[PDB]
Amino acid sequence: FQGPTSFHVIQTSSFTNSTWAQTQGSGWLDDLQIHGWDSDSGTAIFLKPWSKGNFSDKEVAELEEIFRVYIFGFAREVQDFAGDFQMKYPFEIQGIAGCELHSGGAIVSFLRGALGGLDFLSVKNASCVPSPEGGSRAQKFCALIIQYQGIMETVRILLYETCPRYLLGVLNAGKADLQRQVKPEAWLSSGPSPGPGRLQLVCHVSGFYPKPVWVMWMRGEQEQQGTQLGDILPNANWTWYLRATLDVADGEAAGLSCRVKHSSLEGQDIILYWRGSGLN
Amino acid sequence: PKIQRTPKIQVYSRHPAENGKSNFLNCYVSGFHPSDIEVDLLKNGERIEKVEHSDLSFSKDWSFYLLYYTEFTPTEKDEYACRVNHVTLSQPKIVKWDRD
Ligand SMILES: *[C@@H]1O[C@H](CO[C@@H]2O[C@@H](C)[C@@H](O)[C@@H](O)[C@@H]2O)[C@@H](O[C@@H]2O[C@H](CO)[C@@H](O[C@@H]3O[C@H](CO[C@H]4O[C@H](CO)[C@@H](O)[C@H](O)[C@@H]4O)[C@@H](O)[C@H](O[C@H]4O[C@H](CO)[C@@H](O)[C@H](O)[C@@H]4O)[C@@H]3O)[C@H](O)[C@H]2NC(C)=O)[C@H](O[C@@H]2O[C@@H](C)[C@@H](O)[C@@H](O)[C@@H]2O)[C@H]1NC(C)=O
Ligand SMILES: *[C@@H]1O[C@H](CO[C@@H]2O[C@@H](C)[C@@H](O)[C@@H](O)[C@@H]2O)[C@@H](O[C@@H]2O[C@H](CO)[C@@H](O)[C@H](O)[C@H]2NC(C)=O)[C@H](O[C@@H]2O[C@@H](C)[C@@H](O)[C@@H](O)[C@@H]2O)[C@H]1NC(C)=O
Ligand SMILES: [Cl-]
Ligand SMILES: [Cl-]
Ligand SMILES: [Cl-]
Ligand SMILES: [Cl-]
Ligand code: NI
Numbered sequence A: 001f002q003g004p005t006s007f008h009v010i011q012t013s014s015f016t017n018s019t020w021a022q023t024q025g026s027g028w029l030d031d032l033q034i035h036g037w038d039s040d041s042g043t044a045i046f047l048k049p050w051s052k053g054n055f056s057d058k059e060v061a062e063l064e065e066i067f068r069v070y071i072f073g074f075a076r077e078v079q080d081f082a083g084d085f086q087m088k089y090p091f092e093i094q095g096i097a098g099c100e101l102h103s104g105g106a107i108v109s110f111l112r113g114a115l116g117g118l119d120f121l122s123v124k125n126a127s128c129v130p131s132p133e134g135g136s137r138a139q140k141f142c143a144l145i146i147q148y149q150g151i152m153e154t155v156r157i158l159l160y161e162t163c164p165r166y167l168l169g170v171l172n173a174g175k176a177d178l179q180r181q182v183k184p185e186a187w188l189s190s191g192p193s194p195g196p197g198r199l200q201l202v203c204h205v206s207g208f209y210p211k212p213v214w215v216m217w218m219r220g221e222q223e224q225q226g227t228q229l230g231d232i233l234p235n236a237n238w239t240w241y242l243r244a245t246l247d248v249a250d251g252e253a254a255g256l257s258c259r260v261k262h263s264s265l266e267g268q269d270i271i272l273y274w275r276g277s278g279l280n
Numbered sequence B: 001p002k003i004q005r006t007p008k009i010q011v012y013s014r015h016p017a018e019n020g021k022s023n024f025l026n027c028y029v030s031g032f033h034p035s036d037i038e039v040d041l042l043k044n045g046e047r048i049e050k051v052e053h054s055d056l057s058f059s060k061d062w063s064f065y066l067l068y069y070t071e072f073t074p075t076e077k078d079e080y081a082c083r084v085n086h087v088t089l090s091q092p093k094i095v096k097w098d099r100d
Helices: A057-081 A132-145 A149-173
Strands: A006-017 A020-029 A032-038 A043-046 A091-101 A107-115 A118-124 A127-130 A185-190 A198-208 A214-219 A233-235 A239-249 A256-261 A270-273 B008-013 B023-032 B038-043 B064-072 B080-085 B093-096
Touching (some): A006 A057, A043 A057, A107 A132, A127 A132, A214 A239, A239 A256, B023 B080
Antiparallel strands (some): A006 A091, A020 A032, A032 A043, A091 A107, A118 A127, A198 A239, A214 A256, A256 A270, B038 B080
16 A cells, blocks of 8 residues: 555644743644644644544544643643753753554554654653663653653553554545545756856656655666755645756756656656757 | 754745746745744745644654745746744845746
8 A cells, every 4th residue: 555654643842941831742644744733722633534543532532631631741740840850941842652554564653752852762662761862861751750650551552552553543544545646747947057067957746646756867768877856845735846956067958858757647657858048 | 952953944836837827835944943933935025924834843853844835926027935033043044936
């Protein structure tokens, strides 16, 4: 199957001072957002009609309540212990947790935390593992948290029992959108000159879904190894954008073409031809 | 918890620019830390009021990223840009849209 193969929740908790902290949270299938968190209500926002997967409305409400209590309690506890952990304001904590489906069918769960944009801890085999970047503070944190009976058990259940069934259920529930095929469009432009007597040619590919794509500059059937793939950029409404560039000498641009291959094109590649002297 | 990272700013159109044809202007802001950021889309130096944006996300290296976008009708003379302010910047950073 094509499309996303993992589910995760994220948290960003920004501590301005000892009496002001705010948290942002959301739920994702790879980099596609399927849940939002509404801080006005302390409840989730279901972004797709299938965002609850195969879970009952009762189980979903139970999970929303766990996250609401967690978000409030997290800020409460961090503010209470910040002095003991020698925290300097402002500071920002990030967290990600979820699970992924691998080749062979195994589902692997993960949980990572960060402080100041650096790794702070991870969960390995239902244990708190301090990250070296986290120093003695992360060691102190893990030793303190594992003594919370309720928290250790809730985390274990959510990562290893709730997440794998939720993932399978939502990959199935959302397959109309997750495994849809959206055709790219492609066009050529003449980019920023890399130097004297040199040109940059740009092949743009936009609006495709899923993300895997193949773009290359060609001279006939010869793939130009000089092709530079840009990083994949997002469009709104679950599609992607990509630039493929080629730096050439002024008199070497004639004869070039850009070829695009995508899963949605049913083996019918897009071929664009670069023409010189402002003939596009 | 001390190193801050300045935002990368990439401006692009959803569709090839055709003068007088409705399109979408995108501004992808990434690689920044901490998360607080102000992003505006500009038309001839003036802020566009109706701009949409993604909820906060971050990459595996913990750097934040956001997509800002708006409907736009490009012409020959009109200029478009993305203006960003962040704690790592002393002044707002402006990246102009360039179809070429
Ligand atoms: C949401 O979906 C989940 C996935 O469902 C499957 O996939 C989707 C995409 C559709 O194709 C569905 O039709 C399909 O069911 C549900 O979770 C899965 O539920 C099934 C039960 O329905 C469960 O199967 C059982 O597995 C155990 C063995 O499990 C252990 O071992 C395996 C490896 O072998 C390991 O992977 C596991 O983690 C465990 O360690 C087995 O003993 C069961 O056998 C019994 O029942 C069968 C008939 O079902 C019978 O023939 C036998 O004789 C025996 O009595 C059975 O095969 C899956 O393991 C489970 N998958 C995961 C990853 O958890 C999910 O169901 C709910 O959770 C389940 C854990 C279970 O409690 C269900 O009763 C729940 O409804 C579903 N709903 C929700 C709300 O999550
Ligand atoms: C603790 O931080 C509060 C929130 O800070 C604001 O939001 C952050 C996310 C960030 O953008 C920061 O720059 C902001 O200032 C402060 O409250 C704010 O205070 C300012 C200035 O007084 C005021 O203009 C804001 O409206 C107010 N915001 C909110 C949401 O309350 C705290 O200030 C104290 O509390 C205020 C309510 C007010 O009584 C003020 O006089 C206090 O200093 C910050 N507290 C401390 C002790 O520094
Ligand atoms: Cl994808
Ligand atoms: Cl809340
Ligand atoms: Cl073209
Ligand atoms: Cl080679
Ligand atoms: Ni400490």
